[PDB]
Design an enzyme around this catalytic site. Sequence first.
Site, PDB file in Angstrom:
ATOM      1  N   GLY A  12      30.090  37.512  29.014  1.00 46.91           N
ATOM      2  CA  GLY A  12      29.999  36.141  28.544  1.00 46.91           C
ATOM      3  C   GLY A  12      31.136  35.229  28.972  1.00 46.91           C
ATOM      4  N   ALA A  13      32.090  35.755  29.738  1.00 43.13           N
ATOM      5  CA  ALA A  13      33.226  34.951  30.193  1.00 43.13           C
ATOM      6  C   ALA A  13      33.035  34.469  31.632  1.00 43.13           C
ATOM      7  CB  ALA A  13      34.552  35.752  30.059  1.00 43.13           C
ATOM      8  N   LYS A  14      33.741  33.404  32.007  1.00 40.96           N
ATOM      9  CA  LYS A  14      33.652  32.877  33.368  1.00 40.96           C
ATOM     10  C   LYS A  14      34.862  33.269  34.206  1.00 40.96           C
ATOM     11  CE  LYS A  14      30.855  28.857  32.094  1.00 40.96           C
ATOM     12  NZ  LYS A  14      30.757  27.378  32.228  1.00 40.96           N
ATOM     13  N   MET A  15      34.596  33.614  35.459  1.00 39.64           N
ATOM     14  CA  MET A  15      35.609  34.102  36.396  1.00 39.64           C
ATOM     15  C   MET A  15      35.674  33.190  37.611  1.00 39.64           C
ATOM     16  SD  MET A  15      35.845  37.951  37.938  1.00 39.64           S
ATOM     17  CE  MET A  15      37.285  38.583  38.819  1.00 39.64           C
ATOM     18  N   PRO A  16      36.870  32.672  37.921  1.00 33.80           N
ATOM     19  CA  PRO A  16      37.064  31.846  39.118  1.00 33.80           C
ATOM     20  C   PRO A  16      36.748  32.667  40.362  1.00 33.80           C
ATOM     21  CG  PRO A  16      38.966  31.711  37.623  1.00 33.80           C
ATOM     22  CD  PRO A  16      38.115  32.863  37.164  1.00 33.80           C
ATOM     23  N   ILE A  17      35.889  32.121  41.211  1.00 34.45           N
ATOM     24  CA  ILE A  17      35.395  32.869  42.354  1.00 34.45           C
ATOM     25  C   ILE A  17      36.442  32.998  43.454  1.00 34.45           C
ATOM     26  CG2 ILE A  17      33.031  32.179  41.828  1.00 34.45           C
ATOM     27  CD1 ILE A  17      33.063  30.265  44.126  1.00 34.45           C
ATOM     28  N   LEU A  18      37.529  32.239  43.344  1.00 37.17           N
ATOM     29  CA  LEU A  18      38.640  32.368  44.290  1.00 37.17           C
ATOM     30  C   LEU A  18      39.931  32.765  43.556  1.00 37.17           C
ATOM     31  CD1 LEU A  18      39.924  32.149  47.093  1.00 37.17           C
ATOM     32  CD2 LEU A  18      39.587  29.683  47.032  1.00 37.17           C
ATOM     33  N   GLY A  19      40.544  33.870  43.980  1.00 31.61           N
ATOM     34  CA  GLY A  19      41.802  34.309  43.393  1.00 31.61           C
ATOM     35  C   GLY A  19      42.877  34.554  44.451  1.00 31.61           C
ATOM     36  N   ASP A  46      45.020  38.311  41.261  1.00 28.39           N
ATOM     37  CA  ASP A  46      44.731  39.747  41.304  1.00 28.39           C
ATOM     38  C   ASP A  46      46.014  40.581  41.441  1.00 28.39           C
ATOM     39  OD1 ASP A  46      42.514  41.950  41.626  1.00 28.39           O
ATOM     40  OD2 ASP A  46      43.936  42.343  43.253  1.00 28.39           O
ATOM     41  N   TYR A  51      51.183  48.008  42.802  1.00 30.63           N
ATOM     42  CA  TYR A  51      51.770  47.068  43.765  1.00 30.63           C
ATOM     43  C   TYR A  51      53.274  46.882  43.537  1.00 30.63           C
ATOM     44  CZ  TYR A  51      46.830  45.799  44.584  1.00 30.63           C
ATOM     45  OH  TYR A  51      45.469  45.808  44.843  1.00 30.63           O
ATOM     46  N   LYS A  80      44.905  46.484  37.275  1.00 27.33           N
ATOM     47  CA  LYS A  80      44.163  47.714  37.522  1.00 27.33           C
ATOM     48  C   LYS A  80      44.949  48.931  37.052  1.00 27.33           C
ATOM     49  CE  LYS A  80      42.797  45.379  41.797  1.00 27.33           C
ATOM     50  NZ  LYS A  80      44.079  44.787  42.272  1.00 27.33           N
ATOM     51  N   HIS A 113      41.248  51.381  39.127  1.00 27.71           N
ATOM     52  CA  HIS A 113      41.621  51.017  40.505  1.00 27.71           C
ATOM     53  C   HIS A 113      40.841  51.822  41.557  1.00 27.71           C
ATOM     54  CE1 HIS A 113      45.263  49.206  42.875  1.00 27.71           C
ATOM     55  NE2 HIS A 113      44.193  49.265  43.651  1.00 27.71           N
TER      56      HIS A 113
END
Length: 318
Positions: A12-19, A46, A51, A80, A113
């Site tokens: 139900g949440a929205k995710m920005p298509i560019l990260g 991300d 990392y 991750k 991951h």
Amino acid sequence: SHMASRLLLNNGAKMPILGLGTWKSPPGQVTEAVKVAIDVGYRHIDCAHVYQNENEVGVAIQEKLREQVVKREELFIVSKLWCTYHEKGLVKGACQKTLSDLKLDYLDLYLIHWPTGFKPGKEFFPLDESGNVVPSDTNILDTWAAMEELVDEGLVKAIGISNFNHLQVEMILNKPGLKYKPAVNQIECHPYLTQEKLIQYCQSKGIVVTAYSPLGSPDRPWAKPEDPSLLEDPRIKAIAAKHNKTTAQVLIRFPMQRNLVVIPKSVTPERIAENFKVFDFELSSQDMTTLLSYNRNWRVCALLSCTSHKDYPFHEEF
Ligand SMILES: NC(=O)c1ccc[n+]([C@@H]2O[C@H](COP(=O)([O-])OP(=O)(O)OC[C@H]3O[C@@H](n4cnc5c(N)ncnc54)[C@H](OP(=O)(O)O)[C@@H]3O)[C@@H](O)[C@H]2O)c1
Ligand SMILES: CC1=C(CC(=O)O)c2cc(F)ccc2/C1=C\c1ccc([S@@](C)=O)cc1
């Protein structure tokens, strides 16, 4: 560009298509990189514990929050769970360490991951006397249950997977007593590894796909001269030229038009800005099919040290 900035996840949440990607971003440069990204419109970052730069990413996020450049609700922060933390009793701590480093009280998305669990310890890649990775006897389903607990404890808003092949995705979807479906499968995807089968499969189940290494990861540590090079492919540069855009911009717009999320990495302020300027043009269906035609099943990230692990994902077709 007929292109919304966010898409709907199955939680139900929205995710920005560019990260903004952060693998290989040096700790002395990633704080600036993230600050610049937020200043120029990125709302999705991300990250990963493996990392080794989450603290420094967190510095940038926290300053931008403190400065009221952006509110927390407007950000979409992804991290991750590393392979050495697949054990039930280690997952919460691993998540909390990431939360502490990023200086957040929740993650918008937390991914397994890799499907492969490794022996717990200080080493991210525990090797035997011969150099093979030492597995853990944890299976992906119990790890998934541990991830589900994170949702129920308020630590993460959504959970997902990364580098899962279609059978492994299926194992989760058919897990006895499954409580939450994966919201996302983050996989390598670009014109040399187009992933039609896996993408169609995930999308048919309401699982959003995130495309990683969309530029071909030219800074990958193991790169060799004989390797193909997306950014130098004349055929791609031609398409970019036709549209008065950069080759990178075409490579970023490409997955967007396939309803994928995409996470190009850069620590270069000029490229960070350029990479975000992809909502002002459209690739034709012909452009899209032509870019798809370049597939050669070539992987940047093959995890070659784990090819014998029971859960190695890339023996399967898709
Ligand atoms: N297992 C996983 O889930 C997994 C695996 C791989 C990657 N990822 C995620 O996906 C992100 C992106 O993938 P990636 O880091 O492998 O590689 P990538 O984003 O395909 O490429 C990054 C490289 O491209 C360069 N670059 C960026 N923008 C450019 C532009 N406009 N023009 C020319 N060069 C440009 C960067 O240089 P500068 O930085 O020097 O500007 C860097 O060397 C990672 O950072 C990570 O967050 C996840
Ligand atoms: C593909 C890949 C990625 C990207 C990722 O997982 O996001 C990665 C990120 C890291 F921070 C460290 C290692 C890796 C890796 C593969 C790999 C590298 C070295 C080794 S040891 C054998 O030198 C083994 C595997």
